[PDB]
Design a binder for these strands. Sequence first.
RNA 1: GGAUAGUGGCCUACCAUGGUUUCAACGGGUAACGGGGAAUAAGGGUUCGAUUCCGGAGAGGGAGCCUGAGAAACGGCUACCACAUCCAAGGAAGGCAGCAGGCGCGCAAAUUACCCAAUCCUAAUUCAGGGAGGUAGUGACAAUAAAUAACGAUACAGGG
RNA 2: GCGGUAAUUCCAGCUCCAAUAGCGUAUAUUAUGUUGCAGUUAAAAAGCUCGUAGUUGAACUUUGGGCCCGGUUAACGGGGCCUUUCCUUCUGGCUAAACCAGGACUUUUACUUUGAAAAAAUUAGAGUGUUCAAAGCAGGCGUAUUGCUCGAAUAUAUUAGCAUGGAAUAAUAGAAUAGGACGUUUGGUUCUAUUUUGUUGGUUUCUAGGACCAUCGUAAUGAUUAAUAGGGACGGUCGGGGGCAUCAGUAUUCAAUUGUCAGAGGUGAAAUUCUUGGAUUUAUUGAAGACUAACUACUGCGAAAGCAUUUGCCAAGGACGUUUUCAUUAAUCAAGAACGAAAGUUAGGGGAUCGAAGAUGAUCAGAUACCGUCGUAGUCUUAACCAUAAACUAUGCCGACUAGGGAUCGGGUGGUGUUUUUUUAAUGACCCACUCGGCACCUUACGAGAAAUCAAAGUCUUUGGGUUCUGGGGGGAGUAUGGUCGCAAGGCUGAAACUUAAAGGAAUUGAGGUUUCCGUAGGUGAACCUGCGGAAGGAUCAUUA
Lengths: 150, 36, 121, 129
Amino acid sequence: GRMHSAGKGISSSAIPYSRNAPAWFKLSSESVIEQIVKYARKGLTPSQIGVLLRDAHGVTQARVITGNKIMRILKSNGLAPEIPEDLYYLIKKAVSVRKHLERNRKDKDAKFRLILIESRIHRLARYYRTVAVLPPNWKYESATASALVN
Amino acid sequence: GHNAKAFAVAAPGKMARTMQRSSDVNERKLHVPMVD
Amino acid sequence: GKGKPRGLNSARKLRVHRRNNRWAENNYKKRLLGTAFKSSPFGGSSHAKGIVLEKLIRKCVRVQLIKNGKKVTAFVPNDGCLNFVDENDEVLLAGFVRFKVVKVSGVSLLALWKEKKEKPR
Amino acid sequence: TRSSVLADALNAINNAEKTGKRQVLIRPSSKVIIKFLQVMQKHGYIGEFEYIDDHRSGKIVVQLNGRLNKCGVISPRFNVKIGDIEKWTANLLPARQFGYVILTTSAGIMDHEEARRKHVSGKILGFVY
RNA sequence: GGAUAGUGGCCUACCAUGGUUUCAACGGGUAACGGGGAAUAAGGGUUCGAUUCCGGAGAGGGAGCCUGAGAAACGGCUACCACAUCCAAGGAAGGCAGCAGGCGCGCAAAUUACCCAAUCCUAAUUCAGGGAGGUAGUGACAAUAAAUAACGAUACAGGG
RNA sequence: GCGGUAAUUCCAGCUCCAAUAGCGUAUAUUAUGUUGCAGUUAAAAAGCUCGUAGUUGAACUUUGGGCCCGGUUAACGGGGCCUUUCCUUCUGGCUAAACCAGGACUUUUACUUUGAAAAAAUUAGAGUGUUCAAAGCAGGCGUAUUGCUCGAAUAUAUUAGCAUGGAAUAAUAGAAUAGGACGUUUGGUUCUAUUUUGUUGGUUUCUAGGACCAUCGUAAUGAUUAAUAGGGACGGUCGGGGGCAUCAGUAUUCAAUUGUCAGAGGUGAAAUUCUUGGAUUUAUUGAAGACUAACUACUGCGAAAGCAUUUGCCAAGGACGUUUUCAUUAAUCAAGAACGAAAGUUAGGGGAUCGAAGAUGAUCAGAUACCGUCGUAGUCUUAACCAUAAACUAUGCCGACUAGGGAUCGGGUGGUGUUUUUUUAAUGACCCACUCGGCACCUUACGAGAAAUCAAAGUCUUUGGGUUCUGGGGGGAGUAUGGUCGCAAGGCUGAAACUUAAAGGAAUUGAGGUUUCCGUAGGUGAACCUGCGGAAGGAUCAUUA
């Protein structure tokens, strides 16, 4: 089930069998675009633009309404960050657990979980450098990762 | 000292038949010793 | 499913695994090292030459092998032919008391039991 | 993880026929599964199957009507020469007047007899009887 | 650049630091000449192949060379190592993994035979030469076919 | 004389049986698993997890229809057209960038068909009365007086190279900062001229063929889902998950003070031991270190080892819920690495209890009922090591399917269902129904197994989802040698010589001591005893629900 655990949960979302035009919306097709880029200029990464857009403004997904994904929209306007979202959050979690391990040398559970997180970062970074969204080497190391995430 | 795996040969059956026949030839030479 | 891999491009793993595993078989090891004939009483031979050392139960004799030097018991078929071997005779033995007397003093025991030949002394 | 959807489909069909079910559901779907099930359906080993279209991969519901003994895949898909077909046929079929082995050749997916008749050979895919 | 019949680090002077490898480099073992082929199988495999044909290597072990189109040739030469022959003691000569044949244990295994008639090879060449080869002799290698009896009359025993 | 004899039949005679110009005997051999083995208990799943190479990897892009001709037994197989569909590199013509005759092409592969080839012998096999046959390649027919004539086939060759048809199956590339495709849309740069100005050297124009830089268009202008795969984000939970700090609870030992007398401990029966300077007991107070009883369950958490007082802080995690994000990022894993009970090792710390070693008591056929007191190391902790356990579910991990039922943990959904609010509104708890993910349980065989038994140990003689590790009788033996790691203890790898064939094992039914073991440490009567930790490969009755 899980990549680094024995869990086998299946909890996920279910996209409906309707690829066009929820009937009760009848609002716009382009206004959502500058709403999204204003949210991105506010300092937000596409997951919470999606969450806040479906929680407040009633847009189910941007794929069904605008016809484009959120990351492609943000890259089309040049607002995409250097590192992708999930790699950024993985590096952030690794930095936090490494600070905790620096404070607590005898936390062997933190050692094991740090190894798990760093292996996950290695796998995702290899996939990103294979598809060439990162620089072709990108050299993940903790000393530059601490300055890179913050 | 070393391994018996490394000091092996390319043909088992030829060793088996030639070694059996050579043993028979070598025991053909045996006699009862006396003085000349 | 099973232990072995089943890929199209996985012949190397199967061949290496078989090569590694065949060494744990007794027949393969004793036929590649050439030491399978030391469990036999004769050594690598089918017949063994020996010296008639003593006359033993009643039919058998006690014969010392000339190659290694150890002494075994020998079966002399056709019990009257017990008297053909006398003392210090040069005999050629085959397996049957796990042994038996075949060729005494160069000639065969069947050529003496049927009075075809006579023993060279 | 799922390495071969055809193996899963044929295992589901075999289990449904063995326990005595009338119809079975298969997820995911494929073109190769559709063609293989048509090859079964032409010789009557199955009943009638229907493709349900969700946007993910599709599902196949097969109505069985008996007369199915054993169907399966041969993984990996070996390369079978045109003289090598009867070797597989003798190796994994009970007799000669019943039992089909199925090949994907460059002329499509078909049983072994149609491959003989067209004089075409390719990779093995499975078998049914 | 030299040398080669000629390419080539084959060798030399110079200059770079390269070349192989867990897809196993390198070292070691092999009672390892390789292949056509042989056996056991229904198939896959496994084992054998010194040996009637093709290719390679060697002529007791290294090394070098002459001649010639072609040899690093040994039924050609020179030297070293190991064996070993002759004698008048100064010296000379040697190489059966060619055909026979002998030794290698005091326990054992084909003829020191005949011929170029056949198949081919060599030369100056129809003609000469060829232990290449053929012929016969020799331990049941293996293999094929096949003698050592067939038909009666008489007396008993029968099925009757 | 009879009978018996571990005479493993001790020997000769009669009879029959098998093969036959051949027959016997000894030894070796026949009667590893891609196909096609096994790993709970017979040999065997690394203690656990991460992870490179290797192996494997969700779905999807031209299908369908009509037309003829057209080969073979109404059927099977072939090609050309149309259906938005035939795509490229050029010479000669019908013409007015649009057709015909023709030289050629997988973007790169893998795959498969066909063909050249691949040496004779050998193998299969056609023909042929060598008197048959093994063979051999012969031979056969006539006016047998000048002759005639059929042959010496054919098949196979399993890799690599060559040519060729197909395009399913499995990979790879193309337009995302347009630096994209296409044009009788125009300017400029840069190069070369098969020529004509007589041949040639050089100068120039025109003209012809390329590449390039900018501008006008031509177009449906260019991005497949979003896997009951995965990772990421978010909401509210949940837990004896971890680290740090802190708090509490009795208990044990010791100390102080007060009471009172002749014993207290211990065991089958004694003794050593403390005790009229008061043992033991009673009461108040204090200190030390260790551990978290009852609540505790066929409950929970963690990768395993393992984890139980309160509170705070730090980081982490599973499951659920989501019309959130990215779009294959995944599975298993040689190399390599993190953690790893207890015991053990080197230093610092305090050292209550227990306590290997040790000091001492009595050994009484029977110790069945083999002990007592004191007590070192150790037990606890910090900083470094070690890396083993019956590290066990004796059952690798990922994915799917297959049978009935009742509980229970965590999340979620519904209930004009219940209760506590002090007004019956949120919540909390309970009940009912459903659903996801767990810990297990009861019955049964659709099946499996040699059986005990198993919802997997099933989907298997009808045998293939992917992948790793292991095993191929028992001693000798996890011993010897070599290597590597460790301060050591020892860990990882790891034989052979010799020996057993009434040999090793798994499940069930027909004089003393006696639980069996594993890792580790120490010491000797009798191959034993004891200390720490772990397992059952050990026999759940009575009450309630």
